[PDB]
């Protein structure tokens, strides 16, 4: 169904692929434990191709977090092919999601889903077509709100996972800046996500304190453009940040 490239030079990176595909297969009780010893000699005995893991295994299986990681080594761009397999992720994930309104299930559902985007924005992020922020994020915030009781989520819940993948407090901020004066519509859950990322920035890097003060700060109960302490610091001082700065 879809044809991707495979090179010899990439081995190594297929076997850790292979590795992954592994793993799931051990666990997978959907699985008979014959057919688990043969695809466990195959996945430690030889390298696949790409197209072979994807078809093969990934799609099969359902392991959609697998089938990004394939995209990636494989230098697969398409953006539609892309977003489609992670819209798979997204409505898997909804499937195992227990709706009770209980605030627990909310959170464990909110935990399990965070996890799993983090772990596979760990090992993705690097890559602009299969970690699209721009086009992730809106997706995020949506689909938790289709999902949960709007009671149940708290601001920070969407942006901290990219945050916590990987992402840079910076890229993070510029990007969801640019969604905020891009669109049209309310954008309060945008802008709850910036109230929460800039208050995160202030206490954790004093490279940043050193700009904006305690009390230019704790203004900002919600963001506006004008509210904006980073673009005021910005309109008198120039827009060096300085380098990147990640959470620890």
Known sequence: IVQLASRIQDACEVAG???????????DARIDSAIKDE??????????????????FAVPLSYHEIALFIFKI???????????????????????????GKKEDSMNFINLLSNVLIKIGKNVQDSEFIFPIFELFPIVCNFFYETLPK???????????????????????????????????????????????????????????????????????EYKIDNDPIEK?????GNNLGICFYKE
């Not at 397999?85 to 709706?99: G, H, I, P, T, V």
């Not at 640019?178 to 109230?195: A, G, P, Q, R």
């Open 39 to 56: 695809l466990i000699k195959t996945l430690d005995g030889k390298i696949l191709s790409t197209s072979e893991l994807f078809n093969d």
């Open 151 to 221: 009671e149940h989520i708290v601001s920070g819940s969407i942006v901290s996972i990219f945050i916590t993948a990987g992402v840079s407090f910076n890229k993070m901020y510029y990007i969801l800046k640019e969604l905020i004066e891009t669109s049209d519509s309310d954008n309060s859950v945008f802008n709850k996500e910036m109230t929460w990322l800039i208050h995160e920035w202030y206490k954790s890097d004093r490279k940043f304190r050193d700009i904006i003060s305690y009390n230019d700060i704790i203004h900002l109960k």
């Open 233 to 237: 610091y910005v309109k008198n001082s």
């Open 74 to 100: 494989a230098d697969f761009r398409d953006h539609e092919v892309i977003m489609a397999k992670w819209d798979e992720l997204f409505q898997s994930l909804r499937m195992e999601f227990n709706n009770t």
């Open 17 to 27: 692929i292979q590795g992954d595909i592994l793993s799931l297969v051990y666990t």
